[PDB]
């Protein structure tokens, strides 16, 4: 009650019906609700709370539906944002959520995230993001070379 600190729990507890005890989304349309609050989450802390939910989500359909509603490209928008603003642990959160959802060869050849993240994996300052990048790049080149 009131407003002095930033309370992101108000958004997810008012919508607690679509959340679990674990913290994931119990129903695949709830993922579209999380995305709906996420795309307009005014602060870094609030939008990062939704990323944690995409990490908790164990279902294949919920992660694929997050991609389907344009969640993967929301991450691609914030990917360039967090790099230019030097938001290193925020960019990390976006990278580990990016690789947590099944980012297929299709998505790779549409958004071309592989060339962007390659610069981090090459010789960045951010050792955390660089090694994390080198993991997902090796995974992405694996699925690419197996297809074409």
UniProtKB/Swiss-Prot annotation:
<feature type="domain" description="TFIIS N-terminal">
    <location>
        <begin position="73"/>
        <end position="147"/>
    </location>
</feature>
<comment type="function">
    <text>Substrate-recognition component of the PNUTS-PP1 protein phosphatase complex, a protein phosphatase 1 (PP1) complex that promotes RNA polymerase II transcription pause-release, allowing transcription elongation. Promoter-proximal pausing by RNA polymerase II is a transcription halt following transcription initiation but prior to elongation, which acts as a checkpoint to control that transcripts are favorably configured for transcriptional elongation.</text>
</comment>
<comment type="subunit">
    <text>Component of the PNUTS-PP1 complex (also named PTW/PP1 complex), composed of PPP1R10/PNUTS, TOX4, WDR82, and PPP1CA (or PPP1CB or PPP1CC).</text>
</comment>
<protein>
    <recommendedName>
        <fullName>Serine/threonine-protein phosphatase 1 regulatory subunit 10</fullName>
    </recommendedName>
</protein>
